[PDB]
Write a protein that binds this ligand. Structure first.
Ligand SMILES: COc1cccc(CC(=O)Nc2ccon2)c1
Length: 186
């Protein structure tokens, strides 16, 4: 099946807890996969305009590890619940992808999660201005704009709204698309 195939692909890139004990400032993100209309999608947030870092930017749910978290996956799930109302029973964490090093002292660990079909996002307006889906296949043939660095523009055909996706967020989206969609019979 589509979902069994995606999970099998993802597990081959799982680094697990290999880098998780290193003494960094630690953040986790959840890369949430949603199946709609016979295709996989990624769920993105738009950060509230009131936030300190990167107001109004597109990102994945996530945030800083706190002492309550049993592990890095727990960070991702706790923050996702706070931001968009995703409950633990509504997500299956499939793997941990390559972590991202920033600012010399920070390590961001991305987890891919399969999202239940009855989840409906409830954006928390103190943290998130918007939540939207992009088909995973978009990231194989994106609309690129050079700002000089590469930015993706995605237009939602439901309403004509355009979102800009860039940086770590754009890079992780491409990675997930390659992992799941490369070398597939039609
Ligand atoms: C891939 O994008 C990133 C990069 C860095 C940190 C985060 C976590 C985060 O702050 N997500 C939020 C907050 C409010 O809405 N989403 C995500």
């Amino acid at each position: 099946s589509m979902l069994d195939d995606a999970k099998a692909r993802l597990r081959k890139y799982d680094i697990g807890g290999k880098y998780s004990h290193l003494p960094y400032n630690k953040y986790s993100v959840l890369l949430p996969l949603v199946a709609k209309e016979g295709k996989l999608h990624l769920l993105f947030t738009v950060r509230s305009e009131k936030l300190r870092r990167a107001p109004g930017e597109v990102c994945f749910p996530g945030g800083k590890r706190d002492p309550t978290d049993m592990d890095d996956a727990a960070t991702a799930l706790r923050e996702a619940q706070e931001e968009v109302g995703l409950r633990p029973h509504q997500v299956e964490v499939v793997c941990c992808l390559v972590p991202c090093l920033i600012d010399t002292d920070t390590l961001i660990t991305p987890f891919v999660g399969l999202i239940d079909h009855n989840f409906q996002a409830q954006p928390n307006p103190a943290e998130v201005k918007d939540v939207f889906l992009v088909p995973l296949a978009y990231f194989l043939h994106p609309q690129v704009h050079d700002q000089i660095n590469h930015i993706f523009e995605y237009t939602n055909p439901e309403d004509g709204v355009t979102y800009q996706i860039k940086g770590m967020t754009a890079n992780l989206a491409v990675l997930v698309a390659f992992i799941i969609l490369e070398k597939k019979p039609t």
